[PDB]
Amino acid sequence: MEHYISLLVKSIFIENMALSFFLGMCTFLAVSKKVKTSFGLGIAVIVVLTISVPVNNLVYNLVLKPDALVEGVDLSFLNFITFIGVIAALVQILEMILDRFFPPLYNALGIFLPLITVNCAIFGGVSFMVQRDYSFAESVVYGFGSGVGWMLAIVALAGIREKMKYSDVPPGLRGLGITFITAGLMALGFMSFSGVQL
Amino acid sequence: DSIKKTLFVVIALSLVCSIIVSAAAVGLRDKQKENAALDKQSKILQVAGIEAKGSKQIVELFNKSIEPRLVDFNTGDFVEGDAANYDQRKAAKEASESIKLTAEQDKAKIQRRANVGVVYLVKDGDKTSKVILPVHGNGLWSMMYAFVAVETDGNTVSGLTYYEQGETPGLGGEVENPAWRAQWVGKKLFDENHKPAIKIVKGGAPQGSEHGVDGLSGATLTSNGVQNTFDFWLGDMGFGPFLTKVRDGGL
Amino acid sequence: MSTIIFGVVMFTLIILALVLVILFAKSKLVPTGDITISINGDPEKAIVTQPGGKLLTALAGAGVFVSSACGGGGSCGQCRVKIKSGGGDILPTELDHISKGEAREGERLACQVAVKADMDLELPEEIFGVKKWECTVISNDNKATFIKELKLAIPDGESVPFRAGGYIQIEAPAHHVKYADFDVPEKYRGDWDKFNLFRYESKVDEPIIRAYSMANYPEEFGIIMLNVRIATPPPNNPNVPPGQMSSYIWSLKAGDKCTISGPFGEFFAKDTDAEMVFIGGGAGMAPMRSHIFDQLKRLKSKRKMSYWYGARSKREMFYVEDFDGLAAENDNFVWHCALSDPQPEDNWTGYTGFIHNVLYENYLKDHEAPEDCEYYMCGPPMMNAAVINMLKNLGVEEENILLDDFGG
Amino acid sequence: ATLFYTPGLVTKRSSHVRDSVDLKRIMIMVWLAVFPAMFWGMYNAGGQAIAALNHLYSGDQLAAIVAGNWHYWLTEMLGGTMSSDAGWGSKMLLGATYFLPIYATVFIVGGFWEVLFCMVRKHEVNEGFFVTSILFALIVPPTLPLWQAALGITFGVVVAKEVFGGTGRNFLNPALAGRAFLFFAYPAQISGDLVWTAADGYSGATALSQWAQGGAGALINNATGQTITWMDAFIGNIPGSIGEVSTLALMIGAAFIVYMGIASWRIIGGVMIGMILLSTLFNVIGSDTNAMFNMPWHWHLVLGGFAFGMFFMATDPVSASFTNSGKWAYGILIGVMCVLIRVVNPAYPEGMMLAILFANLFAPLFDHVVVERNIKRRLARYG
Amino acid sequence: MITIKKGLDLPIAGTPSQVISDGKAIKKVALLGEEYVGMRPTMHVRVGDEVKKAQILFEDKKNPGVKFTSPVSGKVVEINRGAKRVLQSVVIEVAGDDQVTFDKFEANQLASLNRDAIKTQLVESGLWTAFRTRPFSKVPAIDSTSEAIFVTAMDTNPLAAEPTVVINEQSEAFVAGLDVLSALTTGKVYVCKKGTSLPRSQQPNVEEHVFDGPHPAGLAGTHMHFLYPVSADHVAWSINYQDVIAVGQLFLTGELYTQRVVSLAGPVVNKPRLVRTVMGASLEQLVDSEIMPGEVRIISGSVLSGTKATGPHAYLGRYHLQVSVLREGRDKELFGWAMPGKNKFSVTRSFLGHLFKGQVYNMTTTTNGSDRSMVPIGNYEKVMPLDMEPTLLLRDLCAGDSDSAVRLGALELDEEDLALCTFVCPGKYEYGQLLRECLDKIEKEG
Amino acid sequence: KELKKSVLAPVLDNNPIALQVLGVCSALAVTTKLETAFVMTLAVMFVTALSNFFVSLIRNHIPNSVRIIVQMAIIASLVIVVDQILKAYLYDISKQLSVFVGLIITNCIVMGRAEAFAMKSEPIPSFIDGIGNGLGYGFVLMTVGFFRELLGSGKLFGLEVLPLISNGGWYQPNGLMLLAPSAFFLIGFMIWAIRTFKPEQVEAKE
Numbered sequence A: 001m002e003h004y005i006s007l008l009v010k011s012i013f014i015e016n017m018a019l020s021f022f023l024g025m026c027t028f029l030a031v032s033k034k035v036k037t038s039f040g041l042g043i044a045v046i047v048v049l050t051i052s053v054p055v056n057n058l059v060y061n062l063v064l065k066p067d068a069l070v071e072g073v074d075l076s077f078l079n080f081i082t083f084i085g086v087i088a089a090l091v092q093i094l095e096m097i098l099d100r101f102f103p104p105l106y107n108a109l110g111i112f113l114p115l116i117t118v119n120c121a122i123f124g125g126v127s128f129m130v131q132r133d134y135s136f137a138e139s140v141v142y143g144f145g146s147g148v149g150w151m152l153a154i155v156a157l158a159g160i161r162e163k164m165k166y167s168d169v170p171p172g173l174r175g176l177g178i179t180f181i182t183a184g185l186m187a188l189g190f191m192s193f194s195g196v197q198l
Numbered sequence B: 001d002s003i004k005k006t007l008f009v010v011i012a013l014s015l016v017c018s019i020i021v022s023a024a025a026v027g028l029r030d031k032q033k034e035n036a037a038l039d040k041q042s043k044i045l046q047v048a049g050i051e052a053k054g055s056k057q058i059v060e061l062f063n064k065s066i067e068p069r070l071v072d073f074n075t076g077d078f079v080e081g082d083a084a085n086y087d088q089r090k091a092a093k094e095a096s097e098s099i100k101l102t103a104e105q106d107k108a109k110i111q112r113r114a115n116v117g118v119v120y121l122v123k124d125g126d127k128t129s130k131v132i133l134p135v136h137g138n139g140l141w142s143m144m145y146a147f148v149a150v151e152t153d154g155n156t157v158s159g160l161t162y163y164e165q166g167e168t169p170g171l172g173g174e175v176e177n178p179a180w181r182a183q184w185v186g187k188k189l190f191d192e193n194h195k196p197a198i199k200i201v202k203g204g205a206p207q208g209s210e211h212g213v214d215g216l217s218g219a220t221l222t223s224n225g226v227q228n229t230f231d232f233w234l235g236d237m238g239f240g241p242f243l244t245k246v247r248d249g250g251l
Numbered sequence C: 001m002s003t004i005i006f007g008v009v010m011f012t013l014i015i016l017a018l019v020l021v022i023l024f025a026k027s028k029l030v031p032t033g034d035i036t037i038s039i040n041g042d043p044e045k046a047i048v049t050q051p052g053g054k055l056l057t058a059l060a061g062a063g064v065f066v067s068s069a070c071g072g073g074g075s076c077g078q079c080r081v082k083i084k085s086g087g088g089d090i091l092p093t094e095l096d097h098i099s100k101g102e103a104r105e106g107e108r109l110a111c112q113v114a115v116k117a118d119m120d121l122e123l124p125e126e127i128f129g130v131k132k133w134e135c136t137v138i139s140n141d142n143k144a145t146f147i148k149e150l151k152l153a154i155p156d157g158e159s160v161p162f163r164a165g166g167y168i169q170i171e172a173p174a175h176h177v178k179y180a181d182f183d184v185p186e187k188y189r190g191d192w193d194k195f196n197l198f199r200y201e202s203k204v205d206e207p208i209i210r211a212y213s214m215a216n217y218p219e220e221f222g223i224i225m226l227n228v229r230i231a232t233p234p235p236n237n238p239n240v241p242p243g244q245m246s247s248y249i250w251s252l253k254a255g256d257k258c259t260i261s262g263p264f265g266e267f268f269a270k271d272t273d274a275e276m277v278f279i280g281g282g283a284g285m286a287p288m289r290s291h292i293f294d295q296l297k298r299l300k301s302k303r304k305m306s307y308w309y310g311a312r313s314k315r316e317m318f319y320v321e322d323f324d325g326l327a328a329e330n331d332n333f334v335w336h337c338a339l340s341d342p343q344p345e346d347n348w349t350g351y352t353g354f355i356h357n358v359l360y361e362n363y364l365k366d367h368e369a370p371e372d373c374e375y376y377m378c379g380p381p382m383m384n385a386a387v388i389n390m391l392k393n394l395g396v397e398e399e400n401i402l403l404d405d406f407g408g
Numbered sequence D: 001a002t003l004f005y006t007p008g009l010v011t012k013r014s015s016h017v018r019d020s021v022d023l024k025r026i027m028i029m030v031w032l033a034v035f036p037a038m039f040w041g042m043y044n045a046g047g048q049a050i051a052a053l054n055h056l057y058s059g060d061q062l063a064a065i066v067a068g069n070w071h072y073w074l075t076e077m078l079g080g081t082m083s084s085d086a087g088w089g090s091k092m093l094l095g096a097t098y099f100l101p102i103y104a105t106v107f108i109v110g111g112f113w114e115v116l117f118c119m120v121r122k123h124e125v126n127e128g129f130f131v132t133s134i135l136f137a138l139i140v141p142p143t144l145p146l147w148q149a150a151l152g153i154t155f156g157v158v159v160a161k162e163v164f165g166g167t168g169r170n171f172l173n174p175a176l177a178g179r180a181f182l183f184f185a186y187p188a189q190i191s192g193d194l195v196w197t198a199a200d201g202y203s204g205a206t207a208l209s210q211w212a213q214g215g216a217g218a219l220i221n222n223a224t225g226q227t228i229t230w231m232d233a234f235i236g237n238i239p240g241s242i243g244e245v246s247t248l249a250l251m252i253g254a255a256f257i258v259y260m261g262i263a264s265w266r267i268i269g270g271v272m273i274g275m276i277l278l279s280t281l282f283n284v285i286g287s288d289t290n291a292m293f294n295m296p297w298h299w300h301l302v303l304g305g306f307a308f309g310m311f312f313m314a315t316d317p318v319s320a321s322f323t324n325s326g327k328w329a330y331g332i333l334i335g336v337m338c339v340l341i342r343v344v345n346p347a348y349p350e351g352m353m354l355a356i357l358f359a360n361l362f363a364p365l366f367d368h369v370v371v372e373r374n375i376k377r378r379l380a381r382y383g
Numbered sequence E: 001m002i003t004i005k006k007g008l009d010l011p012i013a014g015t016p017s018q019v020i021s022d023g024k025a026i027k028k029v030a031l032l033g034e035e036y037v038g039m040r041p042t043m044h045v046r047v048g049d050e051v052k053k054a055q056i057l058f059e060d061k062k063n064p065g066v067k068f069t070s071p072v073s074g075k076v077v078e079i080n081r082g083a084k085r086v087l088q089s090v091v092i093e094v095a096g097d098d099q100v101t102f103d104k105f106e107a108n109q110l111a112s113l114n115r116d117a118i119k120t121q122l123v124e125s126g127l128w129t130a131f132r133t134r135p136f137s138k139v140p141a142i143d144s145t146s147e148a149i150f151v152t153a154m155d156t157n158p159l160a161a162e163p164t165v166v167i168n169e170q171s172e173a174f175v176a177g178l179d180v181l182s183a184l185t186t187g188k189v190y191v192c193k194k195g196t197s198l199p200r201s202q203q204p205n206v207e208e209h210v211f212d213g214p215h216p217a218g219l220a221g222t223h224m225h226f227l228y229p230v231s232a233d234h235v236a237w238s239i240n241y242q243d244v245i246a247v248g249q250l251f252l253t254g255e256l257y258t259q260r261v262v263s264l265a266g267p268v269v270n271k272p273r274l275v276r277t278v279m280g281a282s283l284e285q286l287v288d289s290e291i292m293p294g295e296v297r298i299i300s301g302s303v304l305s306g307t308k309a310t311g312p313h314a315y316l317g318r319y320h321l322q323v324s325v326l327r328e329g330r331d332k333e334l335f336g337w338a339m340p341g342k343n344k345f346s347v348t349r350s351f352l353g354h355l356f357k358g359q360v361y362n363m364t365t366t367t368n369g370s371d372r373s374m375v376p377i378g379n380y381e382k383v384m385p386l387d388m389e390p391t392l393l394l395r396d397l398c399a400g401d402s403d404s405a406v407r408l409g410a411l412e413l414d415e416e417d418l419a420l421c422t423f424v425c426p427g428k429y430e431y432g433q434l435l436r437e438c439l440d441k442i443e444k445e446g
Numbered sequence F: 001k002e003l004k005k006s007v008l009a010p011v012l013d014n015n016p017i018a019l020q021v022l023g024v025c026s027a028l029a030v031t032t033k034l035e036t037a038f039v040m041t042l043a044v045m046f047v048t049a050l051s052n053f054f055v056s057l058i059r060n061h062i063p064n065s066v067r068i069i070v071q072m073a074i075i076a077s078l079v080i081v082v083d084q085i086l087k088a089y090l091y092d093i094s095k096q097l098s099v100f101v102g103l104i105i106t107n108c109i110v111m112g113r114a115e116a117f118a119m120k121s122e123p124i125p126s127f128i129d130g131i132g133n134g135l136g137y138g139f140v141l142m143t144v145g146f147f148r149e150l151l152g153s154g155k156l157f158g159l160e161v162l163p164l165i166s167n168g169g170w171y172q173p174n175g176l177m178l179l180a181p182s183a184f185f186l187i188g189f190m191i192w193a194i195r196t197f198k199p200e201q202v203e204a205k206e
């Protein structure tokens, strides 16, 4: 029970998805104006990530693994299409299950809840799970840790961009340019955990 | 719209894409295997001193000069088995092919050790001229893998190379420097009492001593790793007994 | 070869399982009923519709546009509805066009909404009650160097129900035009030959819709009297097609009926003792003639009025005898005019210059309290912006000014 | 221009009487507060240089080393000496010939960037750079090249401050955004053991690497052969950066700016609480192979850059929290991260810079949590 | 009893001697037009028309039905109008005693009047302008009511008059005014006072509360925040003690009672005391031969929140009860910011003035420093006693975020509440004008 | 010539990392070396063009329910073929591009163009728009890779330009260029330069 807490702490801090692997930057730098919208999108990404990683681990360890169906046949070229299919189907049925109720969370995200399918955090999490060869419980804890780390990074950037209402930025750097430089300074600050052996 | 229409179009699209993907995936595995083999054959031929340029030259030199075997680590004897298909990194993960290292012997922080190991014998016609041992340990940022080219007396070193490292390139990534690799030639591995005697000195080596090479400048935490790899792998859990057999003349 | 067969079978099965579970979950979750809207919350004229889709297409199927200018994107913010029922979440483009105070009641943009649930919409102000009329052309005499003063009549002699100053939603048929087709009276042809303006040729591919303004008061039945400016691009390259509704008229021979509709009600004169001052705009002078004749005859306003008006030349001038007779019969009226481009052959004995300077240096500077008055304005862009600077420099707050210009 | 004279303006509106403080007085007080640490840092750098040189070389070899480097032959020209019997005057002069070029190049290059941005955006050039330049020149090792110092202050001023708008409008620490650029870009001249003692050919580790190697019994000073006592690490007789070594002078300088209300006792107490709690947790846990788990709080306080960081760099007003309830949390986060990067991260032997640059991102989150609690308390109609 | 811990009692020299002595003969009065929030006048006079006491001078365009009436009987002599023809003052010249009278009632029958009779009496008399609503500090609309009328019966401004000296002469009028306010309001009347005794009304919904501590414990905004927190849909009114004496004397006599007791003080006044003075009087005639030689600035109100009275504004404002005069600090000093400023006042402890307890300063009108950007060293939390977040709130006001400032609490405020945050700011900001721009944005946005 | 303006609109007028924000993760993680920057530019260009062409070919019969599944099936088949070809003939570059030869599926440029322009156009202008957006993306990849590789290791495509100290030259490499903060800063200053040469792309003040 110390091992899974080690995995959670590592996947939140030492191997942050947004600011140590740099995945998801389009929504990370576009939806970062208000902290409440950032909070909602972080919770949505958490749910979709912790659902998508264990199901893809089941599909991989049952079918796509070398010598899993018939000995002598390995089907590890359908990895990408399988992963993106499961992620797209989970996002669609989850947005229907959501959109039944929840005008709180519906139309707060709005256009970007269809756009968390084409979002490199989920595909990177699945591909890194496949690479590192996790079991099912380690897959669940890794997915939840990656989701909470991404939510932490995007809510931090939202808080910084809400503190920056006072600042005076040159006209060429209003918006996207100063957002790029702000994310760069954040990534510079997150290198404190760069050498930890966890 | 129509459920028949959507199911028909998705079946047809899946058939076409699956045909193309499966053809392009099966029809290239031979070339992918050839490339993955050549990427390591180049490093082995380079550490053996035999110069190589071009795929034909690489495969022709490796099939006529290098001859891989399998060695058991504990007993120090030869074990019959397929050489060109063995994967020591993956066999060192399963419990039926690897052992659990306890903390008192695990000086190098690798946490496992495979039951059978692979070496490479540089052939000179009929005679065995060198034996190449792959050693590795933990540095600061990564698991540093390497080769070492030991001559037939089991004591002398003829070359060293580092083919996998993730250190910072200015400080501790100087294990890939030719001026640093060029010091290892001529150094002894053991002493007269047949004990491991490779030292990484801090602040420069003595002028021509046969046991200590120069440490990385400003990079002690990787120099501790480069010391620990040889401190463990020249020990008793590594190539110790096989090196005793080579020293007695098991080649 | 077995790997290819297994790849094909597993690709097809993996895709088909996901398609099946998506369709099953959608058939379990999403609604499939027939949702209903009710116009004005009334049992008559209520409309049933399929779920989803914007409200823009609903009234277009019902037979009115919205009273919109733009359908795409809602950038002009024309489509509005005063909905009291639950519609859903507000969108910031609505909150751009409709401020917080108005949006508190629910004034929302229509095409931004995608109606997928039940709703009773307001849709006020009788936009269902708009009808059409096949207006004939009487004549298109040229009063100025470039102007196109226009007279139309509604078939069988009635009056459009438009409120004062309300321009109709006039449409235009399509026919390709060259300037050589355009018939010109005696004096203006020579200067148009100086600009050799017959040189360009243009094409009218689609019937262009342009809600121009008209030139009579609502009580003047049996005649419609529209208005048209000269169609002219940058005259270095006039090959690009200028002003398709204007060019539809500029060669037109009168007597053909025109299917047009859509009255407006913008110029709401307030019923107070408010001093009215009608600052001129050259082209579009007759909107103010319409509103002043409505205030003279339809409402019989005996309050103090004025018609400061701008002019380039007396050759450019028109409808003089109207305001001359009006100020003759009227006690509380005065009318003036000034030359924008003075020329010697008038030997003019009145004011000259810009309307900005003439109003301030004649009337307003020694006026008692300009902040209590009321100013309507419709004309050239700089000759309106300078006057807005003058009026804000003198007092009057924004709501007391009532602006409406050609294209805003 | 307006440095010598107060401008003689009068107020035009509502408050016809004002205070007496301004950014000139605030930043000049913080600029004067590091003068004891500056003078002691120059003294200690000279002392360590002379002791290392006379431990290594002697006689004609010492004369050849002296006549082959301008820091040594200029110091012997101006009247001092470089033998073992050097006075405090010669030690402070040898520290001055190392520190003052770095201060000069940092001030001139950063002032050029300030003046260029201020002429382009049509403002009047303000203070605060007085603080940033001296705090940058006081935290780099005494053997840092001048071109790297110029690059560091260029990054710190331009990328961290003057793009965001100037004084009072950024969010990071400009003196530490430059040092982090140096630390991650050119780490061969800002880490290791060749760099800290300003000598020629002296390679000897320092107080925080010796502990991480072998515990408190391996704290031996190789220049003299003596051992490092707590009074030595507290007074400031250890190798390190220029003006970070003396906790006594740092406390004496920062007591004044804490008394005057410029520095925040909330942040200082938060940093101290976080350090004490995490170091005590690591002591009680304990380890057999990591020799930093058993380093007490009164040794964590004095070694490395903890006292300089906590006193002068964690109390930056623009980058900190803005709520009294959030300043304690920001300080506690700084202390926890400092002790954690020290103890469990082996690539870096000290972590105050990365602790501050990590908490600067999460300060406005603590602001947001406190002000959202306040907004709920307001909507409940009690505030 | 509510005690205030965060605040500042500003030590400026020239505290008045609280006795009421006669004032000079006043010959001109004026009804300033810019000092009413959101007013757009329609003038009912021109230069030279003879007016009476309580005769209308202008109405309001944006608040219809309210009337602004003249304080004294005489003749209009000037109507000044600034840039964009904004009204500044209506200078009346007093001669005569012609007036418009009203109905009168007994002493005890005041508590049971009809609300509409009360409101039409106040509106026709032009004493309805004494009420300042909260939020937005406007004169309240004639057909709206409120459940809390906050009567300010203390004064913690610097050099301010003592209210007990004034009230102890007109106790019957004060009690009758409180009974009229008790009949006028829907809920209660919140008489806020200090630890001394005041005349009390025997109505059950007139409550007395004791506030102590330094300034701002004597502001209606602080009283509202501690007793009845207001918002966009909860609206409270406000009226000082002199206008309650005016309401009582109006309902007991039928005539508008326009006299005032103002506190003439400052560093440069020879004998600071209280004076009797008509409403809207001329300060240039009030301070005639009362000031030392030297350039001076004649404020109409306290030095924290007061309109500077120079030229067409040289008349006592409506809602101000004191006059404060001080010098002009136009001197350049060599290295003035680096002095051990024993003669320099500050909230912080940089200067050596804080060791000398009990000192008074001859503060001049200079701004010690240029305008710079805001570095929050922690000065606003020292002098804001309310339960807000001062640095965040002021940073939103400077940034221009109306919604966020309203959410943090900038509806309950007025420009005399951020006077201390304007006072202690090292960046030399002026938050009153920023708050007024923000509240005007909220009003215009609807 | 409509094709010239079609392929040269998104190179500086509608750049996918400058005006739109699409395709940033690959821009941060590929530009360490200019060879991998070139290979990624070509691969994204190829995938975007052929994906737009196919989804525009069958754009009439794609249903409203599973349009996402169909588009990701087409893009994923194309990217798997590209990946097999890279692993066969460009193996070392395929090793250096460890996971980002799979993330071309979830790259936002390919799907954003296949949803915005492919479903409502003709196959040949769809192919041209795909090529043009590949070019507009490769421009930013190339410039960031040029600055990062040159100032961080003194090389261009592997060719030695600035001689390092360890070899015996004069240059000491900037170790921050091999980390993603340098990519962030370089993209920020590039947006500054682009929007100060063309001022109609300034974000309006709020």
Ligand SMILES: Cc1cc2nc3c(=O)[nH]c(=O)nc-3n(C[C@H](O)[C@H](O)[C@H](O)COP(=O)(O)OP(=O)(O)OC[C@H]3O[C@@H](n4cnc5c(N)ncnc54)[C@H](O)[C@@H]3O)c2cc1C
Binding pocket: C167, C208, C210, C211, C212, C213, C227, C228, C229, C230, C231, C232, C233, C234, C240, C241, C242, C243, C244, C245, C246, C405, C406, C407, C408
């Ligand atoms: C209430 C109201 C009343 C109006 N009344 C009038 C009126 O009386 N008269 C009037 O003329 N308009 C009037 N307008 C404006 C009307 O919308 C215009 O006719 C319209 O802007 C032109 O539409 P078009 O398709 O006919 O122009 P097009 O024929 O498509 O030509 C474009 C317009 O811009 C010019 N133009 C052509 N090529 C270029 C080019 N390359 N660069 C720049 N400009 C070019 C042309 O002269 C032409 O006017 C009114 C608008 C409103 C809302």
Ligand SMILES: Cc1cc2nc3c(=O)[nH]c(=O)nc-3n(C[C@H](O)[C@H](O)[C@H](O)COP(=O)(O)O)c2cc1C
Binding pocket: B140, B141, B167, B168, B171, B172, B173, B218, B219, B220, B221, B222, B223, D183, D184, D187, D191, D192, D193, D205, D209, D346, D347, D348, D349
């Ligand atoms: C950014 C950075 C990266 C570093 N990388 C390495 C490294 O890869 N290998 C190494 O041995 N030391 C590295 N170091 C230096 C270590 O921090 C360590 O302190 C150094 O080797 C000094 O050890 P020593 O004083 O005992 O010689 C790095 C330092 C920094 C600042």
Ligand SMILES: Cc1cc2nc3c(=O)[nH]c(=O)nc-3n(C[C@H](O)[C@H](O)[C@H](O)COP(=O)(O)O)c2cc1C
Binding pocket: D139, D191, D196, D205, D206, D207, D208, D209, D210, D239, D240, D241, D244, D303, D304, D305, D306, D308, D309, D313, D348, D349, D350, D351, D352, D353, D354
């Ligand atoms: C504010 C501040 C922050 C510092 N941060 C670091 C750091 O993050 N890493 C580091 O190696 N040294 C840092 N230092 C320098 C250390 O104090 C110390 O001088 C250096 O690490 C040498 O290690 P030592 O403690 O063994 O002497 C910092 C110094 C100061 C003043």
Ligand SMILES: Cc1cc2nc3c(=O)[nH]c(=O)nc-3n(C[C@H](O)[C@H](O)[C@H](O)CO)c2cc1C
Binding pocket: D026, D027, D030, D128, D129, D131, D132, D135, D161, D166, D167, D168, D169, D170, D172, D173, D174, D175, D176, D262, D263, D312, D313, D314, D315, D316, D317, D318, D319
């Ligand atoms: C107590 C105090 C401490 C300060 N510490 C720093 C610092 O550590 N680094 C820096 O660049 N500026 C520092 N400044 C200056 C100022 O805060 C800095 O310009 C802000 O970051 C504005 O960008 C300090 C100022 C004060 C009053």
Ligand code: FES
Binding pocket: C068, C069, C070, C071, C072, C073, C074, C075, C076, C077, C078, C079, C080, C109, C110, C111, C112
């Ligand atoms: S114009 Fe289309 S929604 Fe308003």
Ligand code: FES
Binding pocket: A023, A024, A025, A026, A027, A118, A119, A120, F022, F023, F024, F025, F026, F106, F107, F108, F109
């Ligand atoms: S997040 Fe990488 S492209 Fe959308």
Ligand SMILES: [Ca+2]
Binding pocket: B089, B092, B110, B112
């Ligand atoms: Ca291994």
